[PDB]
């Protein structure tokens, strides 16, 4: 067989396995080949299940129709996003926090922004992450060449600061033990633990970043699930404007997981060590590596940020929060230590004396329910399993009845 | 002012100026301040102007409506794209060329794929580009760290092989003079020259890549504009499957510039020097750095690849080809050497003994028509101006009458 003389990217070689979520999808698919008539309930991947509200879909359909008319047709959009959408995001989520329309960059989703930010930061920065956390932060770091190899003793990529988050520390790290890095990826409410940082904790985080001269990338993808009275934006913390940016999405708010619309906010006062504004480099990346979010998706997002849109999103969110309560109650009644579920649409269940992959496989084989192994979220996730609350009500109820039946005589 | 201690990405510092098209927008705005009553006609950026065909927008509106129903709702899609869409692309454009559904990756656009491919290849590859060519190839290369500094004497970034395409070589590189690189970006029909490589030329290109052990990234985003009997896909050349991938888009075919939908094809036989299949690394990038194209945009693209959709796209393309003929005839009658136009919806006009930025400024100043200076596409573009044929018919006719008024005394 012929091979080129092009050397494979050594950063790709570093990755220890495939990306987590397609591996879960693969295992689900394998299970269905084994048992074609299994009534599988999927609570692994955090995939929304309920329909998008009609007020929002009607806006998208209207835009689609408009694109077939002379007056209503539009081509390329500004890569940063339509001005009225940037304005709506700025006022709805950041009104009173000193965020301008020009500080908002509309994306086709938070996952995509994480990687474009990583291209922007480049190969020479060091990163810190919560341990456990959503695996895109670590994997994008590896891809960009910010890391060393995977160390199998500790299950960590070299040169990444893994900030230990545990039940005993309330899932917020002891910052006195955290080494200095250039970037700190911080998710609140955290995926997978569900932990929402308090105002006091976020104040610590901003103070830590300021003293270390670090940039915080704050992922607020689940913030509208907040029930406790905690900040939903990092910009609620005075001084955050000098050290932080925020990335978020409509995925979990409007069921836009397939529609694709999010945003990143980079404040004017966020500067590199040479005084160059970080937002100006992000703008160059967005203008060079991207051609903007879909015009139909943008029209949908604009409809979200209206009284009817916000009401509709609130209802969807509330439904999933009720699902979460059902799941918490099930695992609590079975005698497990259960974390999260208060401020986020997933629950974080401790399974002592078992590997999380083994628990995942057992649950899938015996109950035909898909979950996510905690170790997929980093070494601090070992011994835990994440259960998503996204599902039709009857599916959540059925999954819980299956869990109870499996575990009630043990557990 | 507070500054972080994070160093600006030194690859971002290498960039000479902003991205070309935002720079043109800036000059258009300045022109409007100078002439507030000017009736500006834009033939600069290749932005489609005519409405999307109803058969296609109807499918998109239908998908939007379906998302508000239990049965019709879908959340995350596989990052690679819906299987029926992958299948439709593979058969419609590559049937008989040995391309499988699994070799096709659906994107939110060709521009985005260029940069995801560059993340995949990484910082250690060297690239070759046509000179002139679409500026994203060079700029993405600089951003990824594949280059040295910009040299102002020659107007080139160090470490890029600029393959000069000129009237004297029929706008195809003299490959015997081209140095070996890892990657060869090759656009046919070329943007900005309009030149479509012949079967013989593409055969030379594949042979060159095979002997050098290079990967060709073949950009076919204007291939449906082909009028001459030339190959529309690199995979028409036997052996291409060992050295080439292809990237394309619906932007210029269906007016999807704002809708966002393209694809990349990477064949099974394309391997790195260690035998590792390139498609497997692209798949990792697509699954880690992307969350899939918009579901509504995918529904639109599926509708394009039907008898009614293909007929509709043919009509759209035919309209722009007629605009192109109007422009060609205008410049030819004025005594200019006009290139391109035959196989692409833009024309490449030779303005010898002038700087292209000066010609751009002159045309904009005197006729209120925006064009694109050739030097924006690299140093080989100096002395030419690209004129886009995307416009309403009356706007094309008017721009041409303005050109005739400006240039009547030149020949
Ligand atoms: C903290 C956090 N940030 C960003 C995202 C992705 O948001 P988006 O691209 O806007 O849909 C997510 C989504 N995570 C889901 C969905 C994972 C599968 C999806 N395909 C993905 O890779 O994001 C999960 O953890 O189950 C997230 O948790
Ligand atoms: C040659 C070429 N490639 C790629 C693009 C970007 O295409 P898309 O609109 O799908 O992002 C353009 C415009 C182009 O002219």
Q: How far apart are CA A142 and CA A16, in angstroms?
A: 10
DSSP state of B78: -
DSSP helix, strand, coil percent of chain B (3-state; round to 5): 45, 15, 40
Question: How many angstroms away from the CA of B107 is the closest CA of chain A?
Answer: 11
CA A72, distance to chain mean position in Å, is 34
Angle A2-A7-A13 from CA coordinates, rounded to 5°: 110
Cα separation, B103 vs B105, in Å, equals 7
Beta bridge partners of B339: B348
Q: Does A285 touch chain B (CB under 8 A)?
A: yes
DSSP code for A272? -
Distance between A143 CA and the closest CA of chain B, angstroms: 8
Under 8 Å between Cβ of A164 and A130:
no
Per the entry, the structure determination technique was: X-ray
DSSP characters over A176-223: GGPPP-SEEEEESS-TTT-PPPPHHHHHHHHHHHHHHT-EEEEE-TTG
Cβ of residue B249 lying under 6 Å from some atom of ligand 2 = yes
Sheet order of strands, B384-388 included: B338-340, B346-350, B384-388, B372-373
Tokens of A280: 């100006």
Q: How far apart are CA B340 and CA B190, in angstroms?
A: 9
DSSP state of B171: T
Q: How far is the centre of ligand 2, averaged over its atoms, from the C-alpha of B111 (Å)? A: 5
Which whole-number Å values give the CA distances from B333 to B198, B347, B396, B400, in the listed order? Answer: 28, 14, 16, 11
The answer to whether B241 contacts chain A (CB < 8 Å) is: no
Contact criterion met (CB < 8 Å) for B6 and A214: yes
* Residues of chain A contacting B293 with CB distance shorter than 8 Å: 260
* H or E stretch at B37: none
Closest atom of ligand 2 to B191 CA is: 1
Q: How far is A363 from chain B (nearest CA, A)?
A: 23
Give the count of beta carbons closer than 10 Å to the beta carbon of residue B151: 10
Hey, is the C-beta of B87 within 8 angstroms of any chain A C-beta? no
Cβ of A306 less than 6 Å from ligand 1 = no
Residues from chain A contacting residue B292 (CB–CB below 8 Å) = 258, 260
Q: Which atom of ligand 2 is nearest to the CA of B261?
A: 10
Residue to test with chain B: of A1, A3, A212, A319, most B Cβ within 10 A: A3
> Does the beta carbon of B295 lie inside 6 Å of ligand 2?
no
**Beta carbons of B290 and A111 less than 8 Å apart:** yes
B306 closest CA partner among B48, B63, B89, B109: B89
Q: In this structure, what token pair is assigned to residue A255?
A: 């069921």
The Cα–Cα gap between B36 and B34 comes to: 6
Strands (E), A41-94: 41-42
What separation in angstroms does the CA of B378 have from each of A130, A272, B46, B136, B150? Answer: 44, 30, 17, 11, 12
- Terminal Cα-to-Cα distance of chain B (whole angstroms): 59
**Residue B110, ligand 2, Cβ within 6 A:** yes
CB B392 within 8 A of CB B59: no
Measured between beta carbons, which residues in chain A are less than 8 angstroms from residue B124?
Answer: 7, 9-10
- The bound ligand whose nearest atom lies closest to the alpha carbon of B258 is 2
Could you count the other beta carbons within 10 Å of the beta carbon of residue B366?
13
Burial of B355 (0-12, 13-18, 19+ CB in 10 A): middle
**What domains sit in chain A, N to C, each tagged with a CATH number?**
9-49+306-411 (3.90.1150.10), 50-305 (3.40.640.10)
3-class secondary-structure state, position B313: helix
The answer on whether B13 is annotated among ligand-binding residues is no
Strand, coil or helix: A264 = strand
Dihedral (Cα; B156, B157, B159, B163), 10-degree rounding: -40
Nearest CA to ligand 1 atom 13: A46
Q: Please report which ligand is nearest the Cα atom of A108.
A: 1
Structure tokens at A328: 């918490």
Give the tokens for residue A87: 């304005």
Which residues on adjacent β-strands are paired with residue B246?
Answer: B218, B265
Q: Nearest chain B Cα to A211, which residue?
A: B4
In angstroms, the Cα distances linking A359 to A40, A153, A194, A369, A406 are: 16, 21, 20, 11, 12
CB of A291 sitting under 6 A from ligand 2:
yes
Closest Cβ–Cβ partner in B49, B242, B294 for A259: B294
Contacts of A34 (CB under 8 A, 6+ apart): none
Separation between Cα atoms, residue A64 and residue B259, nearest integer Å: 9
Residue A187 CA: which ligand 1 atom is closest? 1
* Residues B193 and B222: beta-carbon distance below 8 Å: no
Smallest Cβ–Cβ distance between B4 and the set A3, A64, A272 belongs to A272
Q: How far is the CA of B250 from the centre of ligand 2 (A)?
A: 9
- Nearest CA owner, ligand 2 atom 7: B110
CA of A111 to the centre of ligand 1 (A): 6
Chain B residues closer than 8 Å to A18 by CB: 284, 287
Task: Give chain A positions within 8 Å (CB) of B120.
Answer: 9, 12
| B chain contacts of residue A295, beta-carbon cutoff 8 Å | 258-260
Distance separating alpha carbons of residues A230 and A188, to the nearest angstrom: 10
Interface list for B 330-359 with A (CB within 8 A): none
Q: Do B115 and A288 touch (CB under 8 A)?
A: yes
How far, in Å, is the centroid of ligand 1 from the Cα of A254? Answer: 14
**Phi, psi of B381, rounded to the nearest 5 degrees:** -90, -10
Question: Does the annotation flag A172 for ligand binding?
Answer: no
Distance A12 CA to ligand 1 centre (A): 21
Pair type for strands A127-131 and B41-42: unpaired
B9 with A120: Cβ contact below 8 A: yes
Burial of B18 (0-12, 13-18, 19+ CB in 10 A): middle
Please choose, from the candidates B270, B212, B219, the residue with its C-alpha nearest in 3D space to the C-alpha of residue B244.
B270
Residue of B nearest to A184 (CA): B6
Pairing between strand A215-219 and A244-249?
Answer: parallel
């Amino acid at each position: 067989e012929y091979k080129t003389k092009v050397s494979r990217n050594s950063n790709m070689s570093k990755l220890q396995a495939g990306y987590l979520f397609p591996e879960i999808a693969r295992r689900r698919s394998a299970h269905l080949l084994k048992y074609p008539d299994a009534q599988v309930i999927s609570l692994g991947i955090g995939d929304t299940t309920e329909p998008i509200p009609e007020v929002i879909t009607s806006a998208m359909a209207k835009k689609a129709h408009e694109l077939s008319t002379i007056e209503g047709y539009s081509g390329y959009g500004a890569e940063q996003g339509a001005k009225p959408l940037r304005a709506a995001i700025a006022k709805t989520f950041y009104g009173g926090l000193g965020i301008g329309d020009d500080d908002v960059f509309v994306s086709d989703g938070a996952k995509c922004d994480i990687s474009r930010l990583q291209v922007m930061f480049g190969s020479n920065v060091t990163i810190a992450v919560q341990d456990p956390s959503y695996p895109a932060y670590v994997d994008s770091s590896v891809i960009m060449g910010q890391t060393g190899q995977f160390n199998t003793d500790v299950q960590k990529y070299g040169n990444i600061e893994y900030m230990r988050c545990t039940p005993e520390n309330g899932f917020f790290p002891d910052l006195s033990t955290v080494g200095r890095t250039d970037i700190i990826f911080f998710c609140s409410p955290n995926n997978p633990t569900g932990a929402a940082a308090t105002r006091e904790q976020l104040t610590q985080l901003v103070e830590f970043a300021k003293k270390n001269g670090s940039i915080i990338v704050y992922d607020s993808a689940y913030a509208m699930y907040m029930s406790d009275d905690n900040p939903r934006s990092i910009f609620e913390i005075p001084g955050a404007e000098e050290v932080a940016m925020e990335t978020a999405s409509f995925s979990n708010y409007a069921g836009f997981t397939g529609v694709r619309l999010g945003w990143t906010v980079i404040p004017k006062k966020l500067l590199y060590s040479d005084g160059f504004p970080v937002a100006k480099d992000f703008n160059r990346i967005i203008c060079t590596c991207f051609n903007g979010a879909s015009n139909i998706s943008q029209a949908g997002a604009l409809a979200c940020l209206t009284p009817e849109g916000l009401e509709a999103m609130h209802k969807v969110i509330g439904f999933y929060k009720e699902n979460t309560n059902i799941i918490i109650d099930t695992f609590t009644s079975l005698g497990y230590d259960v974390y999260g579920g208060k401020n986020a649409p997933y629950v974080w269940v401790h399974f002592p004396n078992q590997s999380s992959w083994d628990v995942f496989a057992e649950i899938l084989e015996k109950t035909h329910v898909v979950t996510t192994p905690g170790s997929g979220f980093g070494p601090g996730g070992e011994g835990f399993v994440r259960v998503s609350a996204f599902g039709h009500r009857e599916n959540i109820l059925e999954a819980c009845r299956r869990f109870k039946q499996l575990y009630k005589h043990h557990h």
